């Protein structure tokens, strides 16, 4: 059976109110990730015990230490625009992941191919090269602290979701590599989340696929339906 699912979100006061009042009637880890400036309020306000707060993109020893001290134990790293806009390479992302794990963080590590990479049939090579870089900086025990988020760059914010077949093919390819390079025990416990134009309507169908363990989506009222779709 699948490991514990995750639903992560990547008028905020009304939004925190809505989440706080939501009964979630199954086992799922919910995560709200936000920029430094909003962390303090999110932690002050978000009290639902099935939710944790996550930082994003911290890459400095002292910054990570400060976050942990403040009670932040999760972090999202390597998200799409980090790579295609800011210029974080596969190795920079991998180093940030290694540092975070070393500082005691649960890490949602993001990987995914661009439109051209997809169209030219290079999804597998790109995505696997990205995760291999991450794996290079980790030891086996570290994977207990890692969560993989697969997001086709062409599906992020474009309104174009991957089909269930596309998502499943990508997740299975990732899990098979983890199984063979890291170990089948690690593969079986690893959460691989899908992200990119997930909504209330399409999430539950995606979750039905063998290798989908949850979602990364925007912080919006419909995230509640995304949480419900994780079963």
Ligand X SMILES: O=C(O)CCS(=O)(=O)O
List contacts with ligand X (CB under 6 A). Answer: 10, 151, 156-157, 195-198, 216-218
User: Is there a binding annotation on residue 199?
Assistant: no
What is the DSSP code string of 150-213?
A: E--GGGSSSS-PPPHHHHHHHHHHHHHHHHHHT-HHHHHH--EEEESS--TTTHHHHHTSTT--
Active site residue 91: no
Q: What are phi and psi of 159, to 5 degrees?
A: 80, 5
- Kindly state the smallest distance separating residue 180's Cβ from ligand X, in Å: 27
Strand pairing category for 192-195 and 29-33: unpaired
- Kindly state the smallest distance separating residue 71's Cβ from ligand X, in Å: 23
The 10 Å Cβ neighbour count of residue 91 is 12
Q: Which residues contact 107 (CB under 8 A, 6 or more apart)?
A: 74, 75, 76, 77, 97, 100, 101, 145, 146, 147
Active site residue 79: yes
* Cα separation, 68 vs 57, whole angstroms: 14
- Kindly state the smallest distance separating residue 146's Cβ from ligand X, in Å: 17
- Kindly state the smallest distance separating residue 61's Cβ from ligand X, in Å: 26
Residue closer to ligand X (CB basis): 75 or 198: 198
Given the residues 79, 113, 117, 171, the one annotated as active site: 79
Residue closer to ligand X (CB basis): 46 or 198: 198
Residue closer to ligand X (CB basis): 64 or 226: 226
Given the residues 88, 113, 117, 151, the one annotated as active site: 151
Tell me the residue nearest to ligand X as measured from the CB. 10
What is the DSSP code string of 2-19?
A: ----EEEE--HHHHHHHH
Residue closer to ligand X (CB basis): 32 or 216: 216
The answer to whether the Cα torsion of 15, 17, 20, 25 is positive or negative is negative
Active-site residue set: 79, 151
Q: Which residues are annotated as a binding site?
A: 10
Q: Name the binding residues for substrate.
A: 10
């Amino acid at each position: 059976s699948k490991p514990q699912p995750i639903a992560a979100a990547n008028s905020l006061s009304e939004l925190i109110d809505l989440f706080n009042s939501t009964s979630i009637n199954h086992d799922v880890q919910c995560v709200v990730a936000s920029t430094f400036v909003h962390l303090a309020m999110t932690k002050e306000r978000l009290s639902h015990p099935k939710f944790v707060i996550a930082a994003q993109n911290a890459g400095n020893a002292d910054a990570l230490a400060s976050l942990k001290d403040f009670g932040v134990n999760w972090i999202v790293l390597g998200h799409s625009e980090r790579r295609w806009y800011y210029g974080e390479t596969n190795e920079i992302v991998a180093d940030k992941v290694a540092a975070a794990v070393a500082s005691g963080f649960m890490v949602i590590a993001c990987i995914g191919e661009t439109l051209q990479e997809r169209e030219s049939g290079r999804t597998a090579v790109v995505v696997l090269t990205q995760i291999a870089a991450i794996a290079k900086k980790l030891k086996k025990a570290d994977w207990a602290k890692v969560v993989i988020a697969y997001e086709p760059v062409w599906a992020i914010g474009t309104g174009k979701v991957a089909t269930p077949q596309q998502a499943q093919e990508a997740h299975a390819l990732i899990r098979s590599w983890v199984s063979s390079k890291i170990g089948a025990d690690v593969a079986g416990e690893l959460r691989i989340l899908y992200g990119g134009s997930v909504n209330g309507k399409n999430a539950r169908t995606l979750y039905q696929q063998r290798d989908v363990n949850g979602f990364l989506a925007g912080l919006k009222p419909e995230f509640v339906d995304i949480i419900k779709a994780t079963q």
